[PDB]
mmCIF file of C-alpha atoms and ligand atoms in Angstrom:
data_model
loop_
_atom_site.group_PDB
_atom_site.id
_atom_site.type_symbol
_atom_site.label_atom_id
_atom_site.label_comp_id
_atom_site.label_asym_id
_atom_site.label_seq_id
_atom_site.Cartn_x
_atom_site.Cartn_y
_atom_site.Cartn_z
ATOM 1 C CA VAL A 62 122.123 82.807 88.413
ATOM 2 C CA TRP A 63 119.661 85.142 88.132
ATOM 3 C CA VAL A 64 120.105 87.609 90.755
ATOM 4 C CA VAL A 65 123.054 89.466 88.980
ATOM 5 C CA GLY A 66 121.064 89.885 85.638
ATOM 6 C CA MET A 67 117.898 91.648 87.982
ATOM 7 C CA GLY A 68 120.549 94.140 89.691
ATOM 8 C CA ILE A 69 122.185 95.836 86.206
ATOM 9 C CA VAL A 70 118.090 96.929 85.265
ATOM 10 C CA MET A 71 117.522 98.190 88.944
ATOM 11 C CA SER A 72 121.536 100.038 88.282
ATOM 12 C CA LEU A 73 119.748 101.350 84.823
ATOM 13 C CA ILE A 74 116.391 102.239 86.352
ATOM 14 C CA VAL A 75 118.425 104.164 89.739
ATOM 15 C CA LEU A 76 120.600 106.163 87.090
ATOM 16 C CA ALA A 77 117.900 107.033 84.649
ATOM 17 C CA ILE A 78 115.216 108.196 87.397
ATOM 18 C CA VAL A 79 118.398 110.677 89.046
ATOM 19 C CA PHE A 80 119.664 111.639 85.588
ATOM 20 C CA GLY A 81 116.623 113.238 84.186
ATOM 21 C CA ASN A 82 115.610 114.260 87.139
ATOM 22 C CA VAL A 83 118.940 116.292 87.854
ATOM 23 C CA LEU A 84 118.536 117.719 84.585
ATOM 24 C CA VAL A 85 115.154 119.304 84.360
ATOM 25 C CA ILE A 86 116.288 120.711 87.850
ATOM 26 C CA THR A 87 119.053 122.102 86.164
ATOM 27 C CA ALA A 88 117.848 123.723 83.114
ATOM 28 C CA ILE A 89 114.452 125.692 84.766
ATOM 29 C CA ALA A 90 117.265 126.746 87.579
ATOM 30 C CA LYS A 91 119.869 128.248 85.289
ATOM 31 C CA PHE A 92 118.385 129.379 82.751
ATOM 32 C CA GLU A 93 116.244 132.575 83.079
ATOM 33 C CA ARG A 94 114.086 132.431 80.082
ATOM 34 C CA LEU A 95 112.473 128.831 81.669
ATOM 35 C CA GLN A 96 111.076 130.259 84.605
ATOM 36 C CA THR A 97 107.498 130.515 84.847
ATOM 37 C CA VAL A 98 104.583 130.575 87.054
ATOM 38 C CA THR A 99 103.445 127.241 85.197
ATOM 39 C CA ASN A 100 107.010 126.420 85.299
ATOM 40 C CA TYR A 101 107.351 125.661 89.556
ATOM 41 C CA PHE A 102 105.068 123.097 89.330
ATOM 42 C CA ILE A 103 107.348 120.936 86.826
ATOM 43 C CA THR A 104 109.852 121.463 89.073
ATOM 44 C CA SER A 105 107.852 120.516 92.244
ATOM 45 C CA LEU A 106 107.183 117.489 90.335
ATOM 46 C CA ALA A 107 110.742 117.279 89.370
ATOM 47 C CA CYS A 108 111.802 117.619 92.810
ATOM 48 C CA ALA A 109 109.229 114.565 94.191
ATOM 49 C CA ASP A 110 110.568 112.584 91.411
ATOM 50 C CA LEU A 111 114.056 113.035 92.605
ATOM 51 C CA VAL A 112 113.341 112.774 95.792
ATOM 52 C CA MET A 113 111.495 109.369 95.398
ATOM 53 C CA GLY A 114 114.551 107.741 93.055
ATOM 54 C CA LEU A 115 116.874 108.428 95.756
ATOM 55 C CA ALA A 116 115.360 107.313 98.474
ATOM 56 C CA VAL A 117 112.512 104.850 97.633
ATOM 57 C CA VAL A 118 114.301 102.568 94.876
ATOM 58 C CA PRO A 119 117.877 101.851 96.801
ATOM 59 C CA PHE A 120 116.279 100.842 99.496
ATOM 60 C CA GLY A 121 113.846 98.715 98.248
ATOM 61 C CA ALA A 122 116.494 97.137 96.067
ATOM 62 C CA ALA A 123 117.244 95.138 99.910
ATOM 63 C CA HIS A 124 114.441 93.231 100.000
ATOM 64 C CA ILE A 125 114.923 91.884 96.227
ATOM 65 C CA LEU A 126 118.268 91.353 96.469
ATOM 66 C CA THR A 127 118.872 90.035 99.535
ATOM 67 C CA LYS A 128 115.616 88.917 101.308
ATOM 68 C CA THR A 129 116.404 90.001 104.297
ATOM 69 C CA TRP A 130 115.400 93.914 105.707
ATOM 70 C CA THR A 131 118.942 93.740 107.630
ATOM 71 C CA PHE A 132 118.417 97.317 108.926
ATOM 72 C CA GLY A 133 116.890 98.821 111.836
ATOM 73 C CA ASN A 134 113.539 98.655 112.804
ATOM 74 C CA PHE A 135 112.488 102.147 113.298
ATOM 75 C CA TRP A 136 113.740 102.918 109.218
ATOM 76 C CA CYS A 137 110.715 101.080 107.806
ATOM 77 C CA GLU A 138 107.606 103.078 108.903
ATOM 78 C CA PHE A 139 109.826 106.357 107.817
ATOM 79 C CA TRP A 140 110.782 104.531 104.497
ATOM 80 C CA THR A 141 106.989 102.871 103.516
ATOM 81 C CA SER A 142 105.589 106.437 104.668
ATOM 82 C CA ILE A 143 108.587 108.354 102.496
ATOM 83 C CA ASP A 144 107.699 106.395 99.733
ATOM 84 C CA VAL A 145 103.879 107.074 100.013
ATOM 85 C CA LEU A 146 104.746 111.368 100.249
ATOM 86 C CA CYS A 147 106.348 110.648 97.607
ATOM 87 C CA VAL A 148 103.298 109.278 95.157
ATOM 88 C CA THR A 149 100.770 110.721 96.544
ATOM 89 C CA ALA A 150 102.951 114.289 96.127
ATOM 90 C CA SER A 151 103.281 113.600 92.392
ATOM 91 C CA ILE A 152 99.966 112.353 91.750
ATOM 92 C CA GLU A 153 98.684 115.477 92.843
ATOM 93 C CA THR A 154 101.137 117.637 91.168
ATOM 94 C CA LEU A 155 100.133 115.636 87.627
ATOM 95 C CA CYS A 156 96.217 117.248 88.934
ATOM 96 C CA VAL A 157 97.487 120.901 89.939
ATOM 97 C CA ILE A 158 98.971 120.793 85.887
ATOM 98 C CA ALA A 159 96.341 119.499 84.385
ATOM 99 C CA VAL A 160 93.954 122.393 86.217
ATOM 100 C CA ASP A 161 96.311 124.589 85.093
ATOM 101 C CA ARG A 162 96.121 123.766 81.542
ATOM 102 C CA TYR A 163 92.315 124.043 81.918
ATOM 103 C CA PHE A 164 92.254 127.497 83.246
ATOM 104 C CA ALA A 165 94.408 128.606 80.330
ATOM 105 C CA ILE A 166 92.215 127.095 78.132
ATOM 106 C CA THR A 167 88.712 127.765 79.046
ATOM 107 C CA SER A 168 89.023 130.996 79.658
ATOM 108 C CA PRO A 169 92.422 133.407 78.015
ATOM 109 C CA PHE A 170 90.738 137.288 79.255
ATOM 110 C CA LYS A 171 90.277 135.536 82.780
ATOM 111 C CA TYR A 172 94.333 133.721 82.916
ATOM 112 C CA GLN A 173 95.917 136.111 84.541
ATOM 113 C CA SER A 174 93.988 137.606 87.590
ATOM 114 C CA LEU A 175 93.805 133.890 88.370
ATOM 115 C CA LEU A 176 96.312 133.110 88.987
ATOM 116 C CA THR A 177 99.887 135.245 89.862
ATOM 117 C CA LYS A 178 103.361 134.242 90.912
ATOM 118 C CA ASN A 179 102.625 134.746 94.422
ATOM 119 C CA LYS A 180 99.748 132.117 93.942
ATOM 120 C CA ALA A 181 102.326 129.195 93.025
ATOM 121 C CA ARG A 182 103.625 129.383 96.501
ATOM 122 C CA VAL A 183 100.473 129.358 98.511
ATOM 123 C CA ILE A 184 98.820 126.054 96.204
ATOM 124 C CA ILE A 185 102.636 124.651 96.306
ATOM 125 C CA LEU A 186 103.041 124.465 99.967
ATOM 126 C CA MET A 187 98.758 123.854 100.355
ATOM 127 C CA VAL A 188 99.457 120.724 97.924
ATOM 128 C CA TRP A 189 102.721 119.406 100.152
ATOM 129 C CA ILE A 190 100.710 120.129 103.291
ATOM 130 C CA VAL A 191 97.763 117.641 101.871
ATOM 131 C CA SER A 192 99.729 114.886 100.751
ATOM 132 C CA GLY A 193 102.038 114.865 103.589
ATOM 133 C CA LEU A 194 98.874 115.121 106.283
ATOM 134 C CA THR A 195 98.033 111.805 104.620
ATOM 135 C CA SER A 196 101.556 110.162 104.682
ATOM 136 C CA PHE A 197 103.589 110.954 108.474
ATOM 137 C CA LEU A 198 100.621 111.483 110.483
ATOM 138 C CA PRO A 199 98.580 107.862 110.139
ATOM 139 C CA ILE A 200 101.614 105.946 110.140
ATOM 140 C CA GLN A 201 104.238 107.660 112.439
ATOM 141 C CA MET A 202 101.967 106.405 115.590
ATOM 142 C CA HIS A 203 100.180 103.393 114.370
ATOM 143 C CA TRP A 204 97.154 104.010 112.788
ATOM 144 C CA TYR A 205 97.424 101.897 110.263
ATOM 145 C CA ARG A 206 98.170 98.858 111.690
ATOM 146 C CA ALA A 207 95.375 95.350 111.641
ATOM 147 C CA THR A 208 94.628 93.059 114.446
ATOM 148 C CA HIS A 209 94.878 89.606 112.145
ATOM 149 C CA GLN A 210 97.255 87.747 113.314
ATOM 150 C CA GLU A 211 99.163 87.780 110.849
ATOM 151 C CA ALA A 212 101.771 90.690 110.691
ATOM 152 C CA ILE A 213 101.637 90.666 114.659
ATOM 153 C CA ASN A 214 105.040 88.870 114.217
ATOM 154 C CA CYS A 215 106.270 91.423 111.254
ATOM 155 C CA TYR A 216 105.906 94.141 113.555
ATOM 156 C CA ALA A 217 107.204 92.338 116.425
ATOM 157 C CA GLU A 218 110.109 90.232 114.184
ATOM 158 C CA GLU A 219 113.485 92.602 113.508
ATOM 159 C CA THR A 220 114.472 90.928 110.314
ATOM 160 C CA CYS A 221 110.919 91.068 108.386
ATOM 161 C CA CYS A 222 109.542 94.190 106.856
ATOM 162 C CA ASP A 223 105.991 93.887 104.141
ATOM 163 C CA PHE A 224 102.605 96.190 103.634
ATOM 164 C CA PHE A 225 99.644 94.488 105.801
ATOM 165 C CA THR A 226 97.177 97.606 106.711
ATOM 166 C CA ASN A 227 93.835 97.317 108.548
ATOM 167 C CA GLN A 228 90.289 98.183 106.535
ATOM 168 C CA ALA A 229 90.654 101.827 106.668
ATOM 169 C CA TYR A 230 93.475 102.983 105.726
ATOM 170 C CA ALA A 231 94.169 101.370 102.112
ATOM 171 C CA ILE A 232 90.843 102.308 100.700
ATOM 172 C CA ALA A 233 91.141 106.228 102.535
ATOM 173 C CA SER A 234 94.197 106.442 101.190
ATOM 174 C CA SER A 235 93.334 105.374 97.744
ATOM 175 C CA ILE A 236 90.433 107.107 97.620
ATOM 176 C CA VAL A 237 92.079 110.179 98.534
ATOM 177 C CA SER A 238 95.249 109.870 95.857
ATOM 178 C CA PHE A 239 94.014 108.298 93.097
ATOM 179 C CA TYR A 240 89.907 108.059 92.024
ATOM 180 C CA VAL A 241 89.757 112.011 92.537
ATOM 181 C CA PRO A 242 92.869 113.433 90.532
ATOM 182 C CA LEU A 243 91.827 110.957 87.761
ATOM 183 C CA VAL A 244 88.000 111.959 87.709
ATOM 184 C CA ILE A 245 89.510 115.762 87.966
ATOM 185 C CA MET A 246 91.821 115.380 84.651
ATOM 186 C CA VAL A 247 89.224 113.566 82.808
ATOM 187 C CA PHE A 248 86.793 115.971 83.184
ATOM 188 C CA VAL A 249 89.337 118.855 82.547
ATOM 189 C CA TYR A 250 91.207 117.334 79.326
ATOM 190 C CA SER A 251 87.541 116.200 77.549
ATOM 191 C CA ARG A 252 86.422 120.070 78.055
ATOM 192 C CA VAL A 253 89.426 121.313 76.470
ATOM 193 C CA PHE A 254 89.941 118.680 73.856
ATOM 194 C CA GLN A 255 86.582 119.502 72.300
ATOM 195 C CA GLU A 256 87.799 123.166 72.532
ATOM 196 C CA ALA A 257 90.385 121.991 70.760
ATOM 197 C CA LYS A 258 88.309 120.072 67.904
ATOM 198 C CA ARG A 259 85.688 123.345 68.017
ATOM 199 C CA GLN A 260 88.276 125.529 66.987
ATOM 200 C CA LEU A 261 90.003 122.975 64.075
ATOM 201 C CA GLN A 262 85.693 122.689 62.930
ATOM 202 C CA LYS A 263 85.838 126.596 62.738
ATOM 203 C CA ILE A 264 89.232 126.914 60.718
ATOM 204 C CA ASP A 265 88.180 125.050 57.495
ATOM 205 C CA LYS A 266 84.992 127.655 57.480
ATOM 206 C CA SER A 267 87.506 130.415 56.924
ATOM 207 C CA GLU A 268 89.641 128.263 54.910
ATOM 208 C CA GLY A 269 87.748 126.888 51.906
ATOM 209 C CA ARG A 270 90.589 125.683 49.675
ATOM 210 C CA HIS A 300 93.005 114.712 63.897
ATOM 211 C CA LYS A 301 96.549 114.738 64.284
ATOM 212 C CA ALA A 302 96.476 116.615 67.581
ATOM 213 C CA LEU A 303 95.068 113.885 69.052
ATOM 214 C CA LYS A 304 98.691 112.350 69.948
ATOM 215 C CA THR A 305 99.574 114.712 72.669
ATOM 216 C CA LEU A 306 96.142 113.986 74.971
ATOM 217 C CA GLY A 307 96.892 110.238 74.187
ATOM 218 C CA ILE A 308 100.585 109.735 75.040
ATOM 219 C CA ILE A 309 99.450 112.553 78.299
ATOM 220 C CA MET A 310 96.656 110.220 79.578
ATOM 221 C CA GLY A 311 97.755 106.367 78.415
ATOM 222 C CA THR A 312 101.136 106.485 80.014
ATOM 223 C CA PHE A 313 99.685 107.393 83.227
ATOM 224 C CA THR A 314 96.533 105.603 82.734
ATOM 225 C CA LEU A 315 98.389 102.328 81.845
ATOM 226 C CA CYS A 316 101.347 102.891 84.496
ATOM 227 C CA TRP A 317 99.160 103.832 87.849
ATOM 228 C CA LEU A 318 95.651 102.290 87.369
ATOM 229 C CA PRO A 319 96.381 98.736 88.510
ATOM 230 C CA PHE A 320 97.599 98.763 91.430
ATOM 231 C CA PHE A 321 95.379 101.198 92.867
ATOM 232 C CA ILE A 322 92.327 98.368 92.073
ATOM 233 C CA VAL A 323 93.902 95.476 93.099
ATOM 234 C CA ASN A 324 95.159 97.690 96.361
ATOM 235 C CA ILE A 325 91.208 98.197 96.659
ATOM 236 C CA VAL A 326 90.824 94.360 95.858
ATOM 237 C CA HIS A 327 93.093 92.427 98.593
ATOM 238 C CA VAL A 328 91.810 94.056 101.428
ATOM 239 C CA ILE A 329 87.760 93.190 100.942
ATOM 240 C CA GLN A 330 88.681 89.699 100.478
ATOM 241 C CA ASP A 331 92.542 88.182 101.755
ATOM 242 C CA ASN A 332 92.935 85.471 99.460
ATOM 243 C CA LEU A 333 91.990 87.111 95.792
ATOM 244 C CA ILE A 334 95.873 88.592 95.315
ATOM 245 C CA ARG A 335 99.070 87.111 96.754
ATOM 246 C CA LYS A 336 102.685 88.710 97.581
ATOM 247 C CA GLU A 337 104.448 88.464 94.155
ATOM 248 C CA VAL A 338 101.589 90.063 92.016
ATOM 249 C CA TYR A 339 101.499 93.144 94.665
ATOM 250 C CA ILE A 340 104.807 93.536 94.191
ATOM 251 C CA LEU A 341 105.036 93.266 90.809
ATOM 252 C CA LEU A 342 102.314 95.965 89.932
ATOM 253 C CA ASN A 343 104.011 98.490 92.966
ATOM 254 C CA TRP A 344 107.764 97.883 91.357
ATOM 255 C CA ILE A 345 106.049 98.878 87.993
ATOM 256 C CA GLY A 346 103.950 101.919 89.180
ATOM 257 C CA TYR A 347 107.423 103.329 90.482
ATOM 258 C CA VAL A 348 108.630 103.479 86.808
ATOM 259 C CA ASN A 349 106.277 106.430 85.659
ATOM 260 C CA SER A 350 107.939 109.122 87.550
ATOM 261 C CA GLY A 351 111.008 108.742 85.363
ATOM 262 C CA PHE A 352 108.846 108.523 82.133
ATOM 263 C CA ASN A 353 107.651 112.585 83.430
ATOM 264 C CA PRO A 354 110.706 114.363 81.591
ATOM 265 C CA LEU A 355 110.155 112.671 78.888
ATOM 266 C CA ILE A 356 106.694 113.781 78.565
ATOM 267 C CA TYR A 357 106.075 117.452 79.711
ATOM 268 C CA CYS A 358 109.543 118.970 78.938
ATOM 269 C CA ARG A 359 109.525 118.823 74.872
ATOM 270 C CA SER A 360 109.096 123.011 73.961
ATOM 271 C CA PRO A 361 112.073 124.644 71.969
ATOM 272 C CA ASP A 362 113.203 126.665 74.738
ATOM 273 C CA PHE A 363 114.039 123.458 76.651
ATOM 274 C CA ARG A 364 115.389 121.686 74.163
ATOM 275 C CA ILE A 365 118.013 124.776 73.592
ATOM 276 C CA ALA A 366 118.578 124.709 76.488
ATOM 277 C CA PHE A 367 119.806 120.852 77.639
ATOM 278 C CA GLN A 368 121.704 122.299 73.939
ATOM 279 C CA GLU A 369 123.503 124.524 75.355
ATOM 280 C CA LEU A 370 124.334 122.529 78.704
ATOM 281 C CA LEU A 371 126.200 119.532 77.289
HETATM 282 C C1 G1I B 401 104.637 99.640 100.106
HETATM 283 N N1 G1I B 401 103.845 100.492 98.963
HETATM 284 C C2 G1I B 401 102.954 101.223 98.922
HETATM 285 C C3 G1I B 401 101.783 100.544 99.743
HETATM 286 C C4 G1I B 401 100.288 101.685 100.054
HETATM 287 C C5 G1I B 401 99.879 103.031 98.936
HETATM 288 C C6 G1I B 401 101.578 102.798 97.945
HETATM 289 C C7 G1I B 401 101.288 104.316 97.319
HETATM 290 C C8 G1I B 401 99.962 105.075 97.400
HETATM 291 C C9 G1I B 401 99.650 104.683 98.338
HETATM 292 O O1 G1I B 401 97.950 105.755 98.161
HETATM 293 C C10 G1I B 401 99.170 103.817 99.513
HETATM 294 O O2 G1I B 401 98.627 103.495 99.828
HETATM 295 C C11 G1I B 401 102.221 102.179 97.766
HETATM 296 O O3 G1I B 401 104.134 102.761 97.089
#
């Protein structure tokens, strides 16, 4: 008397993700005044989130609802690889946007020389290649498998599918995809906030007669809350196997997926975006 209800929530999640990503992509694509060298990163992030919502979630619903991966054996590895690829691509695009903002604020005169139209394509291709190198290559030819007695049946059985790995790939992927972007973003945003506070203090010297922290807080806190616990538990369960059950792992992995749907609600609030959105509908 509970299976039917959760399907509604999952369908709403899918619909929200798809609608948001499609709306953002259409808005930036159709209207000329919105395209910008900085705005292409938003397009890449929206494309990655749309791919995640279209592929990962609808297929992942089978495990939750039917409790039986009735699909073929070859499909599960592809599904896992595309999921990890989408996650790492989204995280790296977020880090790239943060670095772009740091460069913009820190040096205005040198900003034009550093970044041009052709640079965006090169950097996005490089980041997508480095994101996909760690997803498809180590998974397709079975570098990630474990010699432990458990999951030998899982690879052997046709009806079973769950994520078990050896003690190299989990830690390598966690280091590549989570800790470095967090360090980079924390450093650049701390410097940006310090510069903004310095300017705000300087204004009051010439105006002889902080509410700007909210934007930084909303940018940092939602991402940290969404993604921090998952990689901590991912690191911890591998080193010692009996600490973490499967249900907690699945719940954290699922709550980590909702983050991609909230990026349009946080990263496109400019008046030009709102005007385009109003004009579309
Ligand atoms: C089964 N779900 C996967 C499992 C491991 C993993 C994920 C995402 C990014 C990574 O770097 C990972 O190593 C998860 O989405």
